[PDB]
Amino acid sequence: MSNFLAEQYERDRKAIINCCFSRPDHGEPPNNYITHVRIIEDSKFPSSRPPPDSKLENKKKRLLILSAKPNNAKLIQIHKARENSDGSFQIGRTWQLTELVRVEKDLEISEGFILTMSKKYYWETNSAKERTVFIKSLITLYIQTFEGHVPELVNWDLSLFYLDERSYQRAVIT
Amino acid sequence: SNFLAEQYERDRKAIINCCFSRPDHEPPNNYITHVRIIEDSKFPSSRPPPDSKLENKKKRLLILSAKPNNAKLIQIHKARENSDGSFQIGRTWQLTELVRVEKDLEISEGFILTMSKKYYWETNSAKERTVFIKSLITLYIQTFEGHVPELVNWDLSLFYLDERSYQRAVIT
Amino acid sequence: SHMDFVAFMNKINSINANLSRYENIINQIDAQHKDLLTQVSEEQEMELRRSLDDYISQATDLQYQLKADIKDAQRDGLHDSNKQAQAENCRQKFLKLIQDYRIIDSNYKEESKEQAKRQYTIIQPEATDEEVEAAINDVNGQQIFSQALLAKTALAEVQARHQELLKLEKTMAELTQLFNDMEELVIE
């Protein structure tokens, strides 16, 4: 049907906002939810492409969440969460967007991508077009935040981020 | 110098006679002070170049007044001297619009007033700029509960202020 | 109707006209940036600022018109698969040019802050490096009552570059809000 993903997106969006981005803490106000995506992670291969025959025991169902601090729209955080049996979510790891250094596309797997903060993280989405939507959301959010800079882009179609060759090489942090 | 005190005196009584004497339906405003300025036709918002042709300079006047029923409603006027030998007001601001008052460091006669837009004018000398700005800011302090506009490149001792008293009295 | 289609093509031709018009303006702005970062005489320095000030306003006007003209073509394509894609192709080309302008003012900003730090270590021989970094950064700064020195005229050029940094960042703030305006799929 190709439109169930949009149905579960809004469902997860309300779930994420209800438990993690609406109530105060202990206590700054909650961050502002921006977007999210469902990712898959290989437990014994978290930083590289897993082998094609990795049994389902190694796979994890996680989510990546992008949010900004409530008093500063230029401090974007990258969160990582999992679904509790109760139905809500629990944030496990939070990165600062300034830590983003490299974003790499997997040329072989239409769902896999690599984010590089202090370490390398290999993740893959459920469908090929969910990788495109989220990465375009993340790169756009970075250019908008950091004065029009870009992390090192590898194997990406620069036209997806409204860039070409001479404008990427002019805003790349390297 | 002598004639200068007589120049602004002939302008004062002429401005009152032409624009602040007889009511035109409400009684007119009460004159306060004025200053002769120079406005660049093509560069009214920034410093013009020295090679700006004299066909771009305009002889205007900044007039301060207030409505007779309220001495806290100061208005800023831009008058024009014309070939008829008469004064005519063609621009009016409210004193509350005044946000930033800047002094040109290179040009001893230049000053910037920022109402809705930015306006760069030049007085006929450096001393006439000090008198008008010292009168304008003091009038602003007396009107808006001791607040001052955003002052730039002004020796705050001229307004009996210093560094600590300015940050507390600025409107930002 | 058929006559109702050639008017849409006039809209597309008018947008593409103002897109190449907007691209030449941005490239003209970048040329002024490269020239203003070199040691040029005060004679034609303000002649480059005058052309730059005229180009920046021309860009602001073309951005507003392109924002309206493209969004006008989008709602015309709400019920036509081809008229929607053509208006979408003009939207993607517009956003690409806003990204070019944002990057161009970004490079000129950092190269103007470094150019201002070299102009600031002389008027303030101390401070370096921890305190000269926060002097250029963050309006307002140390320009207030640094007037112990009433060579005397060059003491205000650091304020000319510092205000230009503010004018640049406000422009990028405008370009960012314009970038998010076009990303909204307006419906009618």
Author numbering:
A (entry chain B): 74 to 99, 102 to 249
B (entry chain C): 75 to 99, 103 to 249
C (entry chain A): 33 to 182, 190 to 227
Provide excerpts from the study.
The exocyst is an evolutionarily conserved octameric protein complex that mediates the tethering of post-Golgi secretory vesicles to the plasma membrane. The rate-limiting step is the interaction between Sso and Sec9, which is hindered by the auto-inhibition of Sso. Here we report that the exocyst subunit Sec3 directly interacts with Sso1/2, and promotes the initial assembly of the Sso-Sec9 t-SNARE complex and stimulates membrane fusion.
We have obtained the crystal structure of the Sec3–Sso2 complex under two different crystallization conditions, both of which demonstrate that the binding of Sec3 leads to conformational changes on Sso that is crucial for the relief of its auto-inhibition. The interface between Sec3N and Sso2 is ∼700 Å2, which is mediated primarily by 13 hydrogen bonds and 10 salt bridges. The seven main interface residues on Sec3 consist of K149, Q219, E222, H224, Y237, R241 and R245, which together describe a horseshoe-like shape on a relatively flat surface of the Sec3 PH domain. These residues provide a platform to make extensive contacts with Hc of Sso2, and some contacts with the SNARE motif of Sso2. In the Sso2-Sec3 crystal structure, the N terminus of the H3 domain bends approximately 22° away from its original position, and is tilted towards the Ha domain. The crystal structure suggests that Sec3 interaction causes the bending of the SNARE motif, which then led to the disruption of the hydrophobic interactions in the core of Sso2 involving HL2. The four Sec3/Sso2 dimers in the two crystal forms are essentially identical. Both the bending of the SNARE motif N-terminus and the relaxation of HL2 of Sso2 described above are found in all four copies of the Sec3/Sso2 complex present in the two different crystal forms.
